[PDB]
Amino acid sequence: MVLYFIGLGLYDERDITVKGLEIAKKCDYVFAEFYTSLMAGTTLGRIQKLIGKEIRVLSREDVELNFENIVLPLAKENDVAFLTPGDPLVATTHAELRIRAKRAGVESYVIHAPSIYSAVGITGLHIYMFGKSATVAYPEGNWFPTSYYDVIKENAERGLHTLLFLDIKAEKRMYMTANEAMELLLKVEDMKKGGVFTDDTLVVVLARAGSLNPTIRAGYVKDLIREDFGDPPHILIVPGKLHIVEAEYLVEIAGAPREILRVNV
Amino acid sequence: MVLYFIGLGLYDERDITVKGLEIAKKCDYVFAEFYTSLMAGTTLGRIQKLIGKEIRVLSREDVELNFENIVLPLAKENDVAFLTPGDPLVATTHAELRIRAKRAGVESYVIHAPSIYSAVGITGLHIYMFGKSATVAYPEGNWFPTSYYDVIKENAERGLHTLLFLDIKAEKRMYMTANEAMELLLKVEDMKKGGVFTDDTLVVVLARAGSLNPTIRAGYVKDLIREDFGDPPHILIVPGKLHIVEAEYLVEIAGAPREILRVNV
Ligand SMILES: Nc1ncnc2c1ncn2[C@@H]1O[C@H](CSCC[C@H](N)C(=O)O)[C@@H](O)[C@H]1O
Ligand code: NA
Numbered sequence A, B: 001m002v003l004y005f006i007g008l009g010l011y012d013e014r015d016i017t018v019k020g021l022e023i024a025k026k027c028d029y030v031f032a033e034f035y036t037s038l039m040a041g042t043t044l045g046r047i048q049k050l051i052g053k054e055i056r057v058l059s060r061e062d063v064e065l066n067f068e069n070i071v072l073p074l075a076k077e078n079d080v081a082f083l084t085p086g087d088p089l090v091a092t093t094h095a096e097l098r099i100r101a102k103r104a105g106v107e108s109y110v111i112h113a114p115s116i117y118s119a120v121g122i123t124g125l126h127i128y129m130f131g132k133s134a135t136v137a138y139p140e141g142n143w144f145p146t147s148y149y150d151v152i153k154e155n156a157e158r159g160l161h162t163l164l165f166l167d168i169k170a171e172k173r174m175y176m177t178a179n180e181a182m183e184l185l186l187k188v189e190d191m192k193k194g195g196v197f198t199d200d201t202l203v204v205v206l207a208r209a210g211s212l213n214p215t216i217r218a219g220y221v222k223d224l225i226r227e228d229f230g231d232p233p234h235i236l237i238v239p240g241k242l243h244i245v246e247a248e249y250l251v252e253i254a255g256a257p258r259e260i261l262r263v264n265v
Helices: A018-026 A044-051 A060-070 A072-077 A095-103 A116-123 A147-157 A178-192 A244-254 B018-025 B044-051 B060-070 B095-103 B116-123 B147-157 B178-192 B244-253
Strands: A002-007 A029-033 A056-058 A079-084 A107-111 A134-136 A162-166 A202-207 A215-220 A234-238 B002-007 B029-032 B079-084 B108-111 B134-136 B162-166 B202-207 B215-220 B234-238
Touching: A002 A018, A002 A072, A002 A095, A018 A044, A018 A079, A018 A107, A018 B018, A029 A044, A029 A060, A056 A060, A060 A072, A060 A095, A072 A079, A072 A095, A095 A107, A095 B244, A116 A162, A116 A202, A116 A215, A116 A234, A116 A244, A116 B116, A134 A147, A134 A178, A147 A162, A147 A178, A147 A234, A162 A178, A178 A202, A178 A234, A215 A244, A244 B095, B002 B018, B002 B095, B018 B044, B018 B079, B018 B108, B060 B095, B095 B108, B116 B162, B116 B202, B116 B215, B116 B234, B134 B147, B134 B178, B147 B162, B147 B178, B147 B234, B162 B178, B178 B202, B178 B234, B215 B244
Parallel strands: A002 A079, A002 A107, A029 A056, A029 A079, A134 A162, B002 B079, B002 B108, B029 B079, B134 B162
Antiparallel strands: A162 A234, A202 A215, A202 A234, B162 B234, B202 B215, B202 B234
16 A cells, blocks of 8 residues: 655665665565666666565656556555655656556655755755756757756856756666766857857866765866766766855865866855 | 765654665764754664764854864774764755865765755655755844845746755754744745735745655645644745646645646746
């Protein structure tokens, strides 16, 4: 009669909360989805071993089209866990799955976990200063999205920071790098010419948030666009005006140039 | 010899990540602060038992004034952990403490935990649609802070949602309820008269996120300002322009007036 949406956290199998792990172990069935995001620092095998029970992975189609035929039927008569990377209901459309559970007469509870939305706090940027967020998607065929560019412009105009999720092809486990995102942004700038993203734009890159050794780098585009930030996932942030404390953190912890203390503050 | 900033999560001792618990268990000294937020589902004793370590609780002044005098010295010759509610770098000024650590020759690491900043996803609102955030501060004496009202105004003009952290005076055990925040805002509305927050404004309240049965409610201020949402902590949200799917969830899960389904376009 109960369905638990459990977050797996940011990077590896230990990023799940103790609450999530203990509940998952008590469930009769454990499902998981790895298409809304990825756990780059672990494998299905390691997660399965930590929990101690076999996990059935579900495709996007399984969930979006048949959640009520695969998961809900079991949740009606048993305790079922639905594992997802990050925080459940964040950076996904899983919220509506709770409505489906309600209509199926199934109770649902949410076990939270760290999300990149909060983890970016490790960049030293004040969380309250972040504005609207966006995703930098890979251009493909006749679709070349550029909406993210307007998001940055509107946030920066108000001195707010912009969190940019970088595209990911979950199935293939292929991640867009900060470098590629910077390349695309420069191309959108070349077309829109709004003076929003250029070689002199200060950006922050967060790679592998969650690991004990994430890469946290800050600097001007012309300098970071060709830098190696290590393995995925990569997150790109375009800061607005900086508080002196944010800037010093960037300099001290993220190797940002001293110039930002007089240019971006 | 290192310093670990470890988040404990939203509600109880099990909201810590497995990564954080195992690391904390192996630290020589463990410090903590419980003034940046309220964990309503556990006790210091229960946390100590989980980690198997005696915890030295520090006051705001201990941290802001003497962190480098109380914690860092020990971190030079021992593995030290500093625990905080939720995520240590969200809606706190602890990030700055990493700068102190570095200049003290102490390497530091961060272990994330579920944060209210992303847990609000349980309200069904699109997390990417949130704009600048603000804190509703308690007035003190004749000093009446109101800058948070302007934050809502700015986001609303952009159609963005506004996350309102509510004040907390730990030492005085003062935890601002959503009701109190609504009262303060209505008073600020009468002063500035900007049509930003009124009896007819739609708001969302999230109480005790992290618990299995948090309070999730949505409705007009006039109707909710007198409602009992249970014990603190509480977080208040003023949605901007709603998407149909957000409205659907608020109605289905947060018991919002079915009339919001008919969104304005
Ligand atoms: N479990 C919870 N439920 C509802 N609101 C919460 C909450 N935890 C924190 N808050 C909100 O956030 C305020 C603390 S601000 C510090 C937040 C913390 N670092 C985090 O990551 O969550 C509280 O006064 C309250 O308004
Ligand atoms: Na945000």
